[PDB]
From Swiss-Prot:
GO terms for cellular component: axon; cell surface; dendrite; early endosome; endoplasmic reticulum lumen; endosome; endosome membrane; Golgi apparatus. This is Beta-secretase 1. Changing residue 37 to N: Decreases beta-cleaved soluble APP production. Keywords: Acetylation, Aspartyl protease, Cell membrane, Cell projection, Cytoplasmic vesicle, Disulfide bond, Endoplasmic reticulum, Endosome, Glycoprotein, Golgi apparatus, Hydrolase, Isopeptide bond, Lipoprotein, Lysosome, Membrane, Palmitate, Phosphoprotein, Protease, Signal, Transmembrane, Transmembrane helix, Ubl conjugation, Zymogen. It comes from the Eukaryota. Disulfide bonds join 160-344, 210-367, 262-304. Residues 1-370 are extracellular. Induction: Up-regulated by the Ca(2+)-regulated transcription factor NFATC4. Responsible for the proteolytic processing of the amyloid precursor protein (APP). Cleaves at the N-terminus of the A-beta peptide sequence, between residues 671 and 672 of APP, leads to the generation and extracellular release of beta-cleaved soluble APP, and a corresponding cell-associated C-terminal fragment which is later released by gamma-secretase. Cleaves CHL1. It comes from Homo sapiens (Human). Glycans are attached at residues 97, 116, 286. Monomer. Interacts with RTN1; RTN2; RTN3 and RTN4; the interaction leads to inhibition of amyloid precursor protein processing. Interacts with SNX6. Interacts with PCSK9. Interacts with NAT8 and NAT8B. Interacts with BIN1. Interacts (via extracellular domain) with ADAM10 (via extracellular domain). Interacts with SORL1; this interaction may affect binding with APP and hence reduce APP cleavage. Interacts with NRDC AND NRG1. The chain holds residues 57 to 446 of 501 of the full protein. It catalyses: Broad endopeptidase specificity. Cleaves Glu-Val-Asn-Leu-|-Asp-Ala-Glu-Phe in the Swedish variant of Alzheimer's amyloid precursor protein. N-Glycosylated. Addition of a bisecting N-acetylglucosamine by MGAT3 blocks lysosomal targeting, further degradation and is required for maintaining stability under stress conditions.
């Protein structure tokens, strides 16, 4: 409790391609690299020789595999993945020293799911059963882990922007953050849903209705790269970012993500870009705290940079942009999410990412969409 040296630096990845952990499935253990995703609830792995894959789940080689005789089809905006459901012995080599029987979706057909040149072969859905496919009766991995072992109902993520990080399963590592942890309530157990109560652009309020910041929902999602903002909020935020950075010239398609902006090595103007503070609902009535991100977080290197704030039709998504500045504690036991300044985040001598509180905010319940 507090250390967990085995789990430090157990995450790897490429910028914009997500963070993956090493896992084993079946017996004898079949090693796979698995994308860590707090925005979904299915443990799904490649099970067929797709050309993009380094390796895949071979059920015939596993003596402990049990077929569920059920299929799962998961469509989305770009493509899909389809798989066959079963259960097997699942373990995390650089995690807790345990082995559990968990549900595995063996992917047999996919479109625009696997990435050409990537080093991961599956996805670990760490969200709740409510958004699991085909339905809520299929138990997610972490629910199975807690139920079958003495591992506490908690995990934390330190994502550092080759890219790396740490997933601490069953606890918190105090070396991975500086200062204090600040907790925001999980509004509902489906996605990791939170409530944003105020937004500042360089210490300046957007003066919008706080219900707009959570239009539909607001979520913490390690599977999304960008900081996704509601259309009305995005429009207001970019306008304030445009005005704050008027010293340098940028094309119109850049803010929409249709074009990149490039600068000479070491000549990237950070100071011209504003900081972004998100005020989150606190644990106490009328009490809030704020998390502040640097341009280092929302300007993602592709020195060519992409604008990593995008308009969304599904609510606020606090992706890797937000998460890379902070140590994030998914305290499932107490239905809350902790934020603290990451010990590994990208910062300069001028400005640093911050978690500050407490603040006074009234009518925070009105910010949640119904
Ligand atoms: C199965 O989905 C895919 C498909 C291709 C790549 C991929 O890995 C980045 C995933 C995994 N992951 C699922 C959950 C998704 N998150 C959301 O639905 C919230 C945003 C809407 S407001 C993010 C993507």
């Amino acid at each position: 409790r507090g250390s967990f040296v085995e789990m430090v630096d157990n995450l790897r990845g490429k910028s914009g391609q997500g963070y993956y952990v090493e896992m084993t499935v079946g017996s004898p253990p079949q090693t796979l690299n698995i994308l860590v995703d707090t925005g979904s609830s299915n443990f799904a792995v490649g099970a067929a020789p797709h050309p993009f894959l380094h390796r895949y789940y071979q059920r015939q080689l596993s003596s402990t595999y049990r077929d569920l005789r059920k299929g799962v089809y998961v469509p989305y905006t770009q493509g899909k993945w389809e798989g066959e459901l079963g259960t097997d012995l699942v373990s995390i080599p650089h995690g807790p020293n345990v082995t559990v029987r968990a549900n595995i979706a063996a992917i047999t057909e996919s479109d625009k799911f696997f990435i050409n040149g990537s080093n991961w072969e599956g996805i670990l859905g760490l969200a709740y059963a409510e958004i699991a496919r085909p339905d809520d009766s299929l138990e997610p991995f972490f629910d199975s882990l807690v139920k079958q072992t003495h591992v506490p109902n908690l995990f934390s993520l330190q994502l550092c922007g080759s890219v790396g990080g740490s997933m601490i399963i069953g606890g918190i590592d105090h070396s991975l953050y500086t200062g204090s942890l600040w907790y925001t309530p999980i509004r509902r157990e489906w996605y990791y849903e939170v409530i944003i109560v105020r937004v500042e652009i360089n210490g300046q309020d957007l003066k919008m209705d706080c219900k707009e910041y959570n239009y539909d929902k607001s979520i913490v999602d390690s599977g999304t790269t960008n900081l996704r903002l509601p259309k009305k909020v995005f429009e207001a935020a970019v306008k304030s970012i445009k005005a704050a950075s008027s010293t340098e010239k940028f094309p119109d398609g850049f803010w929409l993500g249709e074009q990149l902006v490039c600068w000479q090595a070491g000549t990237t103007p950070w100071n011209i870009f504003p900081v972004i503070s998100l005020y989150l609902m606190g644990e106490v009535t009328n009490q809030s705290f704020r998390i502040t991100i640097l341009p280092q977080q929302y300007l993602r290197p592709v020195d060519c940079y992409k604008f990593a704030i995008s308009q969304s039709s599904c609510g606020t998504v606090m992706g890797a942009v937000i998460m890379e500045g902070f140590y994030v504690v998914f305290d499932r036991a107490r239905k809350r999410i902790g934020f603290a300044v990451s010990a590994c985040h990208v910062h300069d001598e001028f400005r640093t990412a911050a978690v500050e509180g407490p603040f006074v905010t009234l009518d925070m319940e009105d910010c949640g969409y119904n």
